[model samples]
Target chain A: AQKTFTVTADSGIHARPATTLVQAASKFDSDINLEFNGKTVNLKSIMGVMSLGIQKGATITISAEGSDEADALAALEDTMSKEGLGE
Target chain B: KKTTTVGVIIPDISNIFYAELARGIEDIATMYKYNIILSNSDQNQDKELHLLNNMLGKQVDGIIFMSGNVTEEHVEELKKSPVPVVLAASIESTNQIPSVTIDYEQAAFDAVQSLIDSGHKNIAFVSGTLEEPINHAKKVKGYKRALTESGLPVRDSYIVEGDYTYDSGIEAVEKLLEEDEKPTAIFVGTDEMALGVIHGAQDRGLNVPNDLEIIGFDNTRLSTMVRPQLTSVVQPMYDIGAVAMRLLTKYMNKETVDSSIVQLPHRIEFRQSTK
Candidate 1:
């Protein structure tokens, strides 16, 4: 299962957002991945996520595949909006 | 077998930059119940290897190395290390060694861009030897890239090489001033040198910010000590060391690490240096 987001945050997925995203991702058993700019990184890795340098208005894919793939997708989707990461 | 100890080889503890970095390494080692054996290598490649061998002989769990340059030979020597060697604030040209550093080139570009955004058309960079990878491969590239992107002229005269000392900083800015076309602003490589540039300019009766604006790198304690406190790129020295040691901890324990290359972020801490 997967979800997509258009980064609405002016600074994109900077350190603060990256930190929160990893923390949320770490809570799940699913192998969550954040894909942007043709590069993908484990959502649970701050370094991996920041390396992508997701900019404002860029499209990103959040994919999950594991025992809790569905729950992982739901929680991350909620995080995207609540954290002002994307719409 | 866990030795519960790590070897930290730094340039010198006398410099506040390394002192602050050492603090982070020490704290993290304590947090993990590991002791650290600190050694100063003076950034001399030969001496660095000696210390490396010495530390390994003691059977330290791992090594945290900081130097001005990590050449190919150094990489091979480190590769021979029975234990893992993590680079802290040093670039391994091949990226073979797991390392922790801010994006040096990107930081330079961002700092330069900040000056460019301030409407500065004629900007200069004052730093140490460009022969070193940090200066040549990274910082210089960043400075030129920013200028090029902004459609500004990247002149050779604008890049002044210093020995990372206040005296060198003093002389470099004066040299820039001697020219017919003086820069309105300069990006100093270090805070100590930035202070020298400020003093040197003031000696010539030039007003700071109004006459010549400057931004320093490292954001060391010296930055705040100056009048019209220096604006600088904050490197988070302690954080770099802390994270480096923490990463070494993981490797020592064979814990899963998502990425060995840990790149921390940087920020321009604005002060009175720029208008």
Candidate 2:
């Protein structure tokens, strides 16, 4: 399963939101990846997420594959919404 | 035959600009399980070449070079080096090397135009040695563009030279203040010098924002340390460093990349210095 979000954080997916996403992803039992600008990285890797430097108004996709794919993406969506990172 | 090590050569560590930049490099290095040997070049051509040579001898897998002036000689040498080299916050006029930085021309023009919009008739530009591309090819040209576009006469006299030092900033403002028609607003090169300009203006019995408006480049920590905080261009030093290192890693791993030159975004942050 896959979901896309338009990053809303003014600073983009900088350290704060990147960290939040990574934390949220780590709690799941699925292989999750964050994609932007044709580059995809493991959602659990803060370095990988930050290296993308996804700016505000950027389109990002989070995809999950495994037994808990649904739960993983649902968790990330909640984190993104609560943190005001994206819709 | 990977050493998992990289060399980072910067202008100076004392400058908060380089300090924050180095932290980004270090953090990313740690994440990649790589080590970095950082050296200060002091903007010296010989020292930069020597450090590059030494780092290559140490068998570093890659390098991150930061300098204001990347002459042909430097580029020639860097091209011949076995390890891949990436520039962080530096300009290589030829664009032959991978690098990351903000668009200095647009940033500077926007800064000067803001002062112009505020109805400042005489706007002075305090800058580092015009010999460097960062000042001459980029910022100096940008300032000129702003003036000419606004129908203001571009005066060479308004361009005060400095050594990118705090004292030089003070001296630069003092020199401009001596003109018959003193500048009502000033755009400075760096935060260190901006603070110097502020202190110099304050010491000379002129109130900032009230008597003279000022804006500085590079929103470093020093910007907030002053009483009337500085208004400055926000150059993402840390992000530049991080992206540069990441680019070098990609080159080291023989990964395909889209472009060698990356121009990140820039913005201006206002504070007490500007009315």
Candidate 3:
């Protein structure tokens, strides 16, 4: 399943937020990726996610594919919303 | 009673930045009752080496050194010195020498990030000599990282190299303005250069903080002397010298030190330069 999120964090996904997202993404067994600005990168890699320089108000698409894809997507969505990273 | 002397070498004493650093070193030296022999190396490597040898020959107890660039050969010479040497606001690539400085890379990152947060898209970076690790390896790396992380395009044309002088800053901004897409904001590597950028922008009839915003490194006194008052990254030049001198005193007195490398904290001082 795939879901789109608009970054709400004032500073966007900087170093600390990027690290948080990477750590959260790594716990899932499914393959997860974040697409931004017409480019997609593995959410598991901090460098990959940070390279996107996802600023506030920018929209990002997250895709997860695996047996636990549903659960992983739900958890990540929750984290992003609760952490003020997305709506 | 015998008096002990500590040799001090600075790149340029005339610059207010170095003068403030010297004041810190002298203040500490006075508290410790050690006299200081100061020398101006004019940022020349040969003069630096000569002054160092002369001081060593005089049997100075310890040395507090400052330089724009610390080459491998400089490190080698420092290692051979009999007295304890402490670097103030200077970086050694090998990390073998003892020194005190704020993290230039992270500091630069913070400075640039502030501009990014304010919704600037095209940010130009005016940097010092790319050969100097302090500017190239550390500061510029931070500048790139901020741009990369923000998903902003890092344009080669936007990166202008300066000699860390006022005139270089002016020339750098002038070159950037000539480009097809002028930057909305520019991050200068040094305060002196930042001043040049400010005046250069004004010369071109650009309104600071409106037409263009600027952030400068090194929160030297020059930062405040400008009309718009620069938004700069505070480097704590005096504190770096004071702390480095204190560290040297520890080594000279044979006091146990926890670490040889000291990283000082830095912050951005926002002014009218940035909206």
Candidate 4:
């Protein structure tokens, strides 16, 4: 399953947000990836997510595929919205 | 009776820090009955070399050199000069030349530590060019040490480099603010850049001290001119100049000297910039 998340935080998916995302993505047993600016990176790698330099208002695409993909995707979306990473 | 001439080469006349240093140099020169042949180098190496040659040719008794980037070429030229050379608030990489300056690394560490003590987890360093040893070898090292000692991760993205200009500070902070983990406190390499950071944060609707605290180096007059007076590391530029000039006078007079590398004391001035 794939969902588009637009960053709403004043600071986009920077260091702290990237760290948070990585921590959240690690709990799920699914192949999850985040795509931004035509580049894709593993959602479980902090370094990979931070290297993108995603800025405020940038839209990122998150995709998860596995037996627990739906639950992983839902959890990530909730985390993003609650943590001010996306709307 | 003829008076001894001291050639004073200032990097930039417009900078208030250098201006204060020059004033200190001039005041000391007057006390020693030495006439100063003041010139502005504009920090151009070619211009600096030409000015040095001219001053040497004119038979100046001593030279007070101040430049942000003192290269090996400058050291070679200074070594070949007939008169004694003294550096004020400037660094010569080899430490062969006599200079008077505060310990930049320690000062930076103290400044950043103060912020850490105030419970700022995310701290950013707005630094001068890494090309300059003063910024790279000293200030940057100190900043990193402070963070590491406090068990804080030194994130590469948290470090924003500037060219020691007010505008560069604004641009640097803007770039830093774009990080999702925005710094709650910033340690700027220069007071001018700190002022830029202050205004930049304000423009972004961030409250000073409430949202972000800032600390600057070289407590120049600009520290107080802002709305929330800046807390800065007191570099004592004037004292550096005065002491450097005095050291040169000793060298010219063939007096006994203790050491060529003079590291003056530095302290932080706490103000409204921090909580």
Candidate 5:
């Protein structure tokens, strides 16, 4: 399953939030990923999170599939809200 | 198999101005199958000298130097250099060294002159690095010359020296406003500094181009990122880097190159900042 939303926050997925997303994704059993600007990145890698450098207003798509896919999506979206993103 | 290694000495890697130039240089070097070693000097002359010596010991085939001040010590080192050295975006002394830079004086002249032509007499100059020989000194001279040529007296209160940082520009504008004569328009030396100037004006309840016109040098992408996009002088930083690399390649090939001083054209990027 996949979820998509606009990065409504002023600074979208920069250092702090990206790190939070990466750390959250690591706890899941299924493979999690995020796509922005036509590039897909592993949600489990810290370096990959930093490399995205997503800015505000960018539309991002998150995907996860496998046994824990449902849990992964929920955790990801919760993390985004917890980080005060897309507000 | 032989591989050519080129060393690039940049003042600041964090700044997008130099980063874009590095991208251009790296793209071309990749095309030529050359590996580049990039080092940041933080605009410190001593650190630049140390980086030069360090790159030299690493045995780079050529070097592309982009400095802030372009001190005499660096010029002397380049004179004794066994490898080809090309100074990009800044020139120290154009005697023996090959250099590529934008005409800062004329660019600043045109930028401020635009405001003057628009009937802004009380124009203020926000300079980045008064001690630096290149941007601050040359551009400030152009600003003063334009004021004098237009029959306007050079006012000390109208000029504020900034340090090429966003926060410093805010402080410079604050200082300028404290003077008896409030400026109708402000000319900033760098785009980075202009960012601060624009916000500082807003904090003082002034709107840009409507209440106060703002102009800056170096048409960096940040110019467009802000509201009331900055009207700026385009220095062609990427082209400067590409040309400097090309010049250094020619020198490295042991070819006799003409015109040690290569000054590129500067143009005005008309945007929302100007009326």
Candidate 6:
């Protein structure tokens, strides 16, 4: 599954939110990935997710599939939105 | 080896950046049971290289290097290193090895952009390290871009170069104020220099952010410690060090990993630096 969202926060996808997003995404059995600017990374891995350096107003896509795919994506999106990942 | 040991090389211990990174590295090192030896280089490139050599000589299982210098001189040393090497909060050779850092380009750009958004037309960029080997050159470029994109004139006098120390910061601002036109706002490359800049401004009987707006990089503990809390960028040094060490472990185990270039996230924290 894939979903696109724009970063709304003036500061962009920063550390505190990134840490929270990665930690939340790593909790599931599904293979989670976030894509931005043609670069893709495993959302469950902090190192990989951070390297993308997704900035404010940038578009991002999160996709996953497995036993926990639905739950994983929902958790990630919820965290991203809640933490102002895109905002 | 019973357990891995990683050496961390820092430039200055007094600087909060290195202290925070050390804390992060130690926290992760304990969790992984990797003994860590930390040494300071005092911002000396030769001493930095020597420290790296010493780490290699000690046969450290791995190394996490954060230096004031990013020259290729160390590239050859790391090339034949038996133990994996990773960089934290500092750039390394191109495609050299795994490392973690903040997206400096965006962070610098966003920093200057913040000054621009704050209605600062005549903004000055005061840098601690304006030379090569350090990616701070990109900051100068970023500042220039912000000024140009905003249609603000880029004045040569507005570029203040200084070493990454408090004294240099004081000198830079002193020189900046000597110019015919003083900047309404100033962006410093590091928090260390920002302190000096703030003191310099205060000595001149100027109120920070109100009289002369100031923005700084590296949201170190010093950010809040200053008279007017510094508006600065957070480098996430702890996370960077922890992640860099973790990446080195992957390299040691020969695990399939992503690219070597890793840019951690950063953000600007609003404080008394700007109202």
Highest TM-score: which candidate?
2
How would you encode candidate 4's per-residue C-alpha lDDT over B243-275 as one tens digit per residue? 677678878888876578787556677667887
Total residue pair clashes for candidate 6: 4
Please provide, for model 2 over B29-134, each residue's C-alpha lDDT reduced to its tens digit, 9 standing for 90 to 100: 7656689998999888898998899889888999999998888899999888888998888887788888877789878888898988887888889988898888
Q: Model 6, range B1-275, lDDT digits (tens) per residue? A: 42377888888877777877786677656655788988987767688778888777777888888876666767778766777888777875576756677777667777787887787778888886566545445777777776788788888668878877888888899999998887888988878788889887888889988788888888777787888878887777667866777687777667876667677667778788787
Every candidate's fraction of true contacts kept comes to 0.00, 0.00, 0.00, 0.00, 0.00, 0.31
The full ranking of all candidates by lDDT, starting with the best, is 2, 1, 3, 4, 5, 6
List TM-score per model, in order.
Answer: 0.77, 0.83, 0.74, 0.73, 0.73, 0.76
- In model 2, state the lDDT of residue B48: 90
Instruction: Choose the strongest candidate by DockQ.
Output: 6
Supply candidate 1's per-residue lDDT for B153.
Answer: 84
Model 5 error, position A53 (Å): 32
Query: Model 1, range B136-230, lDDT digits (tens) per residue?
Result: 88888998898899788899878888887898888998998899988879987777898888887888888878888788898777888887788
Lowest lDDT sum, 10 consecutive residues, model 3 chain A, at A10-19
**Candidate 5 residue lDDT tens string, B91-184:** 6755567887778788878878788989887898988767778855688888888888888868866887877788988888888888887888
Candidate 6: list runs displaced more than 4 Å: A1-87, B1-3
Docking class of 6: incorrect
1 against 4, candidate with superior lDDT: 1
Candidate 5: the clashing residue pairs are none
Cα TM-score of candidate 5 = 0.73
- C-alpha RMSD over true interface residues, each candidate: 5.6, 4.3, 14.5, 21.2, 14.2, 3.6
What fraction of the native interface does candidate 1 get right in terms of contacts?
0.00
